[PDB]
Design a protein around this ligand. Structure first.
Ligand SMILES: O=c1ccn([C@@H]2O[C@H](COP(=O)(O)OP(=O)(O)O)[C@@H](O)[C@H]2O)c(=O)[nH]1
Ligand SMILES: O=c1ccn([C@@H]2O[C@H](COP(=O)(O)OP(=O)(O)O)[C@@H](O)[C@H]2O)c(=O)[nH]1
Ligand SMILES: [Mn+2]
Ligand SMILES: [Mn+2]
Lengths: 284, 284
């Protein structure tokens, strides 16, 4: 009844069904990580039992961590790839979108699944639930998750989509870090910088293929860190910059400034970026 | 050091100084109210000692209350004016902006001060602090407050201003319900509907007169009700619609829809409006 293929309840496919449906296609899983020493092993362990079965390849894309992220991921049996190793001829820029774009050069699956490394005890069926529509559907190229407060999501991204791309009003979690897509789709799209990467991918997929190429699946419940409001302010600024650009509206490029009370106030300006990485295809 | 006249500490003007500075100008205070029976008397009592002195006129603009708002405001000695009485030839529309626009026809002060009726024990100097720059300055026509978490303000309005009107990046509380302005300015501007009214007035003032006509004053600390996230979602949608329109960007007019978990979800669509009230001047 939503114009977007939506799975409201627990998917019924068995792991053995999903594997049969692969039909020669491979599956890579990428966990981007910046300083997630507390949660990274729980995330890797939720998925590693699938490896050499449903999942052909699993990597941690380490995004500059200075804690114990890398040593703990290695002790959980994961292949860890730095931003530099993924694509060593090209100097590294900051932010999540850079990490995800680089991960395309360090994987080879026909299907790529992204799962954030800050999840607290994620369900082991996340990955099977995300790949279902790509495997058993026709024409699905991108699958977004939703789940059971998403302040940026409910105050910024969903209302801006209603304003500027109302056809995507049916997407419940447009900014979700858990999703899967075909390599063919991902290497044909630019990747927005920083926290803009998810909203950019969704609007670009829709603008290029329409709703029929996109599905969303209920993952039930998900837990993670709640960042402080000021960090959310910078994140929201970058989401806004990427969304305005995809909708053809010129963004000033001026970073958000904040005034912090100590009354007595101090000022801080956060970076925003208007520069995308190009489709990974051009790097061939 | 901000390009906008900003008073960072407690203003030094005495009530007797402010009165002398009036020089024949009058001052009206308007408290818009929709179902504020718990807080309305505290707000009125914070200001009524100024009446017949600094303040020439005080009204409660009752915006359709069905609780005890009106009887309690009357028992505090306030003149209460319904939306219908303010302008009886014109049928009433919903939302805050309608209430404020109508209040211009029910007052006659050269200066108009707005104070929200949901404040918990507001300081009795709010009104003197807001009128200071209009009275003692030159060329100030609008004064915004700021104070010591404003989720819509920090995630939606300030980052959209940085994107689309970065010159207003120095405004700390663009959505503040406590502000004062000349009647000449207010009756020359359209009024946005619903919760869009503050952002519309600020962008219009700036677009028409530039920064030199706007000041902001520290009111210290303010307290009020924290609305639930879904109501904030609709509010944010209307703020976005008004801000895009003032910046010349076409808004779809499609209301925000929300999916509420009961997993099992239900859907609800909130109204958004693209129709302003015209400058009150046309009603002469
Ligand atoms: O430059 C970055 C920023 C984020 N992340 C990862 O992307 C996900 C989303 O980051 P977020 O800040 O939302 O989570 P948190 O920082 O609170 O742990 C997490 O797995 C981060 O480790 C990343 O790999 N590179
Ligand atoms: O249609 C409306 C909506 C709001 N208000 C008033 O405008 C202020 C801001 O409303 P808000 O919803 O932000 O406060 P709350 O509803 O939580 O009390 C308050 O004094 C409301 O009573 C109004 O007069 N008419
Ligand atoms: Mn997170
Ligand atoms: Mn309020």
């Amino acid at each position: 009844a939503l114009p977007l293929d939506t799975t409201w309840h627990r998917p019924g496919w068995t792991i053995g069904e999903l594997e049969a449906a692969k039909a020669g296609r491979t599956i890579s899983v990428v966990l981007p990580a910046l300083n997630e020493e507390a949660t990274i092993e729980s995330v890797i362990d939720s998925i590693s039992p699938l490896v050499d079965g449903l999942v052909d390849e699993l990597i941690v894309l380490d995004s500059g961590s200075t804690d114990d992220t890398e040593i703990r991921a290695i002790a959980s049996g994961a292949r860890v790839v730095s931003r530099e190793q993924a694509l060593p001829e090209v100097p590294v820029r900051p932010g999540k979108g850079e990490a995800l774009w680089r991960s395309l050069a360090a994987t080879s699956g026909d299907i790529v699944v992204f799962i954030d490394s800050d999840l607290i005890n994620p369900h082991p069926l996340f990955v099977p639930w995300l790949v279902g529509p790509l495997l058993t559907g026709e024409g699905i190229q991108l699958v977004k998750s939703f789940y059971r407060g998403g302040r940026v999501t409910e105050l910024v991204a969903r209302p801006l989509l209603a304003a500027l791309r109302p056809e995507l009003g049916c997407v419940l979690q447009p900014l979700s870090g858990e999703y899967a897509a075909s390599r063919e789709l991902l290497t044909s799209l630019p990747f927005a910088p920083g926290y803009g990467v998810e909203i950019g991918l969704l609007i670009d997929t829709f603008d290029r293929l329409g709703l029929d190429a996109i599905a969303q699946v209920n993952l039930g419940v998900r837990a993670h860190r709640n960042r402080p409001l000021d960090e959310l302010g910078a994140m929201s600024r970058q989401v806004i910059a990427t969304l305005l650009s995809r909708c053809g509206i010129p963004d000033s490029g001026v970073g958000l400034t904040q005034f912090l009370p100590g009354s007595d106030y101090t000022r801080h300006t956060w970076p925003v970026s208007l520069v995308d990485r190009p489709p990974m295809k051009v790097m061939r």
